[PDB]
Amino acid sequence: ASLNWSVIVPALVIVLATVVWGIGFKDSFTNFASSALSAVVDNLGWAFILFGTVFVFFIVVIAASKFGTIRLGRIDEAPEFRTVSWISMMFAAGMGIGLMFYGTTEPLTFYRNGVPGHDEHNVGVAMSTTMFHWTLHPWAIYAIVGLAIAYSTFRVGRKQLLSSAFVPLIGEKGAEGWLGKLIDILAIIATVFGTACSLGLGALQIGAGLSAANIIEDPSDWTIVGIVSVLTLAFIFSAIQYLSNANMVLAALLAIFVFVVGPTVSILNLLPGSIGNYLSNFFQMAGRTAMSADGTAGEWLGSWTIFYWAWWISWSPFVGMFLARISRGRSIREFILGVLLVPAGVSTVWFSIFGGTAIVFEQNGESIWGDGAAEEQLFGLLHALPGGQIMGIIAMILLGTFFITSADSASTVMGTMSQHGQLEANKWVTAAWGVATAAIGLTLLLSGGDNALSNLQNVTIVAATPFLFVVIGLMFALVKDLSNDVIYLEYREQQRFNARLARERRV
Amino acid sequence: SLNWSVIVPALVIVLATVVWGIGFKDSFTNFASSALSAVVDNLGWAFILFGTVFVFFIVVIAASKFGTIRLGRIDEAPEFRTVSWISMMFAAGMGIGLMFYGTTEPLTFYRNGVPGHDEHNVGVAMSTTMFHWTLHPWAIYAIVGLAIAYSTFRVGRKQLLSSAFVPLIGEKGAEGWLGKLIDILAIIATVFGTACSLGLGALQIGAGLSAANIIEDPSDWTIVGIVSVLTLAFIFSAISGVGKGIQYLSNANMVLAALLAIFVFVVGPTVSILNLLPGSIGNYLSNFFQMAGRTAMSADGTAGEWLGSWTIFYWAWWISWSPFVGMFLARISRGRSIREFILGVLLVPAGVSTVWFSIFGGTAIVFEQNGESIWGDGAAEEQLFGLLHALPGGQIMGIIAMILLGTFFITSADSASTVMGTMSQHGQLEANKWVTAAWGVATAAIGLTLLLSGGDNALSNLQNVTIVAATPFLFVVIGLMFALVKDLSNDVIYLEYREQQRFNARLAR
Amino acid sequence: SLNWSVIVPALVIVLATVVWGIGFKDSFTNFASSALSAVVDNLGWAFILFGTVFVFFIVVIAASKFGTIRLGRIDEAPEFRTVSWISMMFAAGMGIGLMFYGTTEPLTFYRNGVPGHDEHNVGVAMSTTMFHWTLHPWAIYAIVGLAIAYSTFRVGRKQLLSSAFVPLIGEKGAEGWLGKLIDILAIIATVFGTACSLGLGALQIGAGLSAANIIEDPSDWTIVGIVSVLTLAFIFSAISGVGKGIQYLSNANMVLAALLAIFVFVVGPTVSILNLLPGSIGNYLSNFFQMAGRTAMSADGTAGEWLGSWTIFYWAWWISWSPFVGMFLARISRGRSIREFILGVLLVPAGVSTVWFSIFGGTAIVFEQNGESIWGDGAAEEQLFGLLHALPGGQIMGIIAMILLGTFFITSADSASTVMGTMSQHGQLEANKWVTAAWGVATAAIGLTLLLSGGDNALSNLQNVTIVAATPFLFVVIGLMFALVKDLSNDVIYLEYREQQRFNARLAR
Ligand SMILES: CCCCCCCCCCCCCCCCCC(=O)OC[C@H](COP(=O)([O-])OCC(O)COP(=O)([O-])OC[C@@H](COC(=O)CCCCCCCCCCCCCCCCC)OC(=O)CCCCCCCCCCCCCCCCC)OC(=O)CCCCCCCCCCCCCCCCC
Ligand SMILES: CCCCCCCCCCCCCCCCCC(=O)O[C@@H](COC(=O)CCCCCCCCCCCCCCC)COP(=O)(O)OC[C@H](O)CO
Ligand SMILES: CCCCCCCCCCCCO[C@@H]1O[C@H](CO)[C@@H](O[C@H]2O[C@H](CO)[C@@H](O)[C@H](O)[C@H]2O)[C@H](O)[C@H]1O
Ligand SMILES: CCCCCCCCCCCCO[C@@H]1O[C@H](CO)[C@@H](O)[C@H](O)[C@H]1O
């Protein structure tokens, strides 16, 4: 049995090529990234937008059908994790700097400028579209992949790999053929690029925060390299439930502080308004394409919606693998519902607090927009409240933990996929994957410079385009696998044997 | 016998309110206004959010596996015929809200508009009226009635609100201070809700008698006489015990309501009404979750006063009526599945309300459009008769409207006094006559005080007081949601199969 | 064993219509216009309300416990392959409506707008097209087909529309005057709904021939020739009934439709079509109840003309096609679950329609936006050919569209004639050849008289006559809902248990 180097060599060489290209040819690299972004958006925004909603419909249908009763493993099998631990490690493994970066910038921006098909200065629209971007589509994508891997690995006992879940469509040989290796390579590439995007955004935010805190006058690239090296040493020392709990506690502390000291009643007013507007406008936002607003929503979608849909598909491999790991013995209905609704509620509360505070300030006359730097909005908001100077440090500690709870899980899963789904993989390969993620993030940030944000968005969309089709195909693979279950095999066989009525009619 | 520990606090608060209202009608009004402002500003979000959470919760309970549990033993058959059951359900749960706001509400929303929408929009008017009168209120009633029914029949506990919280607080908690507090809150909510209904009924009857020329001056003594008659009835009803007064008056209510609705339908713009019907339902389900999200931050944060006048007042009113309506619903729903109940309570009254508002609001809106407006001086109690006198043969339908105004009240305020006696006698099905009479007189008193104070308005005071009185019971209803979930999850049929999971969880480690 | 009592009433109505249309082309037009106005004004609410009630009803029936029943002997299996089954359902369910309104409808709504919305809105245009062509119509078909299938296979009753009403009127009623009336209404609706399609198809073929410049100028003789050809086919195709011509022609229909769709998709704005697709479904599902609640008094009360032209006409058209399409759907759905037939009928045709309207309406709208408008004179019968001639290699596609029109009509006309034969022969599967030929000739004659009358437009006359003829059958479908619920509830599997619950209720003391 040959070792799985056919999935290691291509990914390494591709990422090294990307690194050298981004270093030595910054202008050419940026031009190529922009051109690829334009092509991908123009030709596959429809695919992203359509299947974003098809995922949510598919997941609800699966949990409301006969398949919901199944359990992940042998019949009447019991779980191994407590419910509270299960959710605490669900939310903290599939989240990063997304909430901290776009907690304030997103609803405030949509309030100020508006969205296609709607006029500016509409709090309901701002909050509804934020909830759209952060509540049910993103976690439906994770639920589909996690459910597929959990079904493939526990009920059927296959190896813990993405290619395994495709066995019904392609067969065991196909799982071990070129197609399975291609799927694994695509998964690894998507993981690396998604995590690089997250690392870059988080580093930018930490740099802006340190600049605001007056520790540093101007954020230097050397500071970013130092931060990444510190993270490298930290995780290397590490190589988790404790860190997940710490993340939840720190996030709760910061949210509670802002809620108590900010406009409490306005936040609590925005809660029901946010949820109601979200479900009023759910399919009007899901049906938004480049042909809306007389064909003027292309740029907005490429900047906001398609970026998010590609971003959350980049993280689907390693988040889905983790969720499959931590969901042994749970029913399908319980997996799907925990995953889709607990993180959705957390995100709702987070965005309500921070977006509501920002919008209330913008209404009162005080402004935290400033120059419009998306990386300094959080710290501007905090410095607009008493005790912000001490909560900045808690925000920085949280930021750090949000990527260390995920990068830990990205590297572990990437090691797993490179060893035929072994529970533990080579430490050296894990270190190499961590270094690769760091290197990709750093080169993207440096190459982008002024346009670092846009460069990250373009690259993640390009890298995540291939895995959209993998996730689409995995829907059919999961359906076929669930249909062909031991419970219903005999019944469907009886119907198939009763298929002689067609022959009788032809007679 | 009688508790004597829930009665005394309740009577003390009622008498304090009465003396405050009569002795100092300016201080009372000022306090009511201040408390209303504070309550709205600090708990409108609670009212608005949980109004919708109730509907979601009850729909999920009906749709889930728990909707098969019968509200009796497993081999149980309903004791009431479906038509009689639903007739009593509607007659107990709807007082004078369809008569008072049948014409006023859609007409007001057409003329003035609604936050976040342009005026003179018939679809919006009808949709928001249906929002206020269809699903959200009967969802509250279904939750409370289901909790009490499950507590009393399937588990056999005492017929009280406290007994439904045994899952959360246990028997020692249901007999301690918390049980007494819940019973006192339930009694107070019932008294204040019924008093608000009594005040609105008295106002409407006075206006009607003015219109019909039976009495020239609607002075205070006329209102006292109206309340005295309205109390003598509804006290003889649950006292003489000469027969099935409750069922006979329920049937009379339904018959008179049908008669008046049919009259207006035939003599009014029939085709316009029938056009409104599908339009009303479509625009409702179109804007159902956009109205559920309307709050004090909507319309660029200027919708507070409108919500205080319309939505929060309604949500408090229906919450305050929840205790005794829920107890009655539990009473007449033995041996009915947890889904037949949750779908005969949600859907039948919602359809009746839809038809009622379609007919009356459509007639009013069509008259407004055609120039024969009936707004007059804007008195909410002078709309219906103003409408009725605008149709041929309507001069003799004022009397039927009054008879109907009365019957609606008598029927529900006889369901309320019976249940209050039951609560005050540790869950005795057949309450004491004297306790029933005392609660009826207390309700009448409170209604009279609320009406007399602030005579210039006489309507804002009712809304302020009912919101303030019903604020505490919102949390009781939410706790009822959790208690009901726990009690359904801990059924014997589910216990016998789920115990193995807990037993084997430790072994599997 | 011909009926001779259902045939004669239908024959005299058809002959009266033909004579009136031909010999008096002014009186017929005036009467049609007057009847259309009256019917719309007094029953638009009925059409609009029950359109959505049908969708809700069929969804509930598929979701409820009745979904598990099989439409055959217990533990029976389907007799037709799923792909062939669905191909036949789509090919018989619809004829020349996607070829006629594929381009005209979305383009018209994009240009002029719809009531309550501003013009030049792509989302609105697509959403309302989808509304007219996706869920409501196939819901009507599902209801009627399910009723007939359950009456015939599950209960072994006769294959008639009167038989499905046995639960409500009893066997003596099924052979009584009411059964005869229902059968006559079914035949009349079938004839007058198929004549509408024949007229539209002939008009479009004439326009296409004019566009191709095969004929110097169209004349009534060309229309008569086209109608005669389309009658010879569909009368020469039902004669044999042994060579399996219907399945082969259905497959040919699907193949040619796919070919034309693929050509337009590849050569037209592919990316814009693909952009519209998810946008279409989203906007449908957003404004699904906003459109369901659109009636004659929406948008300042000027939606009457638009509704009568578009939505009520569509509703009436599909209701008129319901008898024969439902009987055919029942015919080819033996031994399938109720849920599997209701999903197969509702969803696959809805998806095919969505894709069709995307590909064609999207191309038209994109051309409108670019300035290459295909509107021309505005005639609805040549928008498609203008569109095709606006694309490279669109000259052969003219001929392909013509053949597709022909096959479209033939596949449904054959089934209509066969079902009329079964109706006229007491539900015999194999009808007499002469009855089939006579009914085909009657359909052709009605189409011709409708087309000749009102020669200036010839389309408004078709719409008026279709609405008038399909009005009576709306109530037959509404009654079919109740009949179906009664027949499903009283099933053998449930009859053995609900008796216990009924007996226990009576002794509830
Ligand atoms: C004025 C207001 C009017 C409108 C009100 C509408 C709002 C809700 C009203 C209340 C409805 C409660 C329904 C709950 C289920 C009850 C039945 C049950 O136990 O079986 C369910 C079933 C359990 O399986 P089962 O045991 O096989 O069920 C059958 C039983 O065996 C038992 O079988 P049985 O033989 O005893 O038969 C019982 C019978 C009882 O059924 C009924 O009577 C329920 C009727 C519900 C439909 C609407 C109300 C109709 C009222 C009929 C009576 C009219 C009276 C007058 C009132 C109206 C006046 C105008 O049938 C059912 O069991 C009902 C099945 C429900 C199927 C789905 C219904 C939705 C249809 C949607 C059609 C439209 C499609 C396009 C949508 C486009 C969207 C953009 O579970 C499900 O399939 C789901 C149930 C829940 C469905 C509704 C959920 C809400 C709708 C979506 C809301 C939007 C948000 C969605 C996402 C969430 C986040 C936002
Ligand atoms: C989280 C809040 C912020 C929003 C975040 C995004 C999510 C938005 C949606 C939030 C609403 C969730 C509604 C509840 C979900 C279901 C929860 C659940 O577990 O409930 C039961 C799910 O039950 C259901 O059937 C769900 C029904 C949901 C109905 C929709 C909500 C009500 C809508 C009311 C308004 C209607 C009118 C509006 C029309 C426009 C579980 O039953 P079970 O399947 O475990 O039982 C076993 C049995 O075998 C089942 O047959
Ligand atoms: C824009 C306007 C919108 C208007 C919308 C109006 C919607 C109306 C939808 C009505 C749907 C009713 O569909 C419903 O189907 C279920 C299927 O089990 C039937 O269900 C019924 O079956 C039998 C009694 O007959 C019982 O065993 C069962 O408890 C009962 O619920 C109901 O008799 C029928 O009423
Ligand atoms: C404007 C017209 C009305 C539009 C309404 C849009 C509504 C969109 C959002 C749906 C959210 C569904 O959430 C799921 O519900 C399932 C039950 O259905 C649960 O099983 C599941 O757990 C839970 O996540």
Ligand SMILES: CCCCCCCCCCCCO[C@@H]1O[C@H](CO)[C@@H](O)[C@H](O)[C@H]1O
């Ligand atoms: C505008 C604001 C709208 C807010 C909408 C929020 C909607 C919340 C809906 C909660 C529904 C709870 O349902 C129960 O859940 C239990 C736990 O899963 C089940 O055990 C039980 O069976 C079931 O009845």
Ligand code: NA
């Ligand atoms: Na994390």
Ligand code: NA
């Ligand atoms: Na009453």
Ligand code: NA
């Ligand atoms: Na056809």
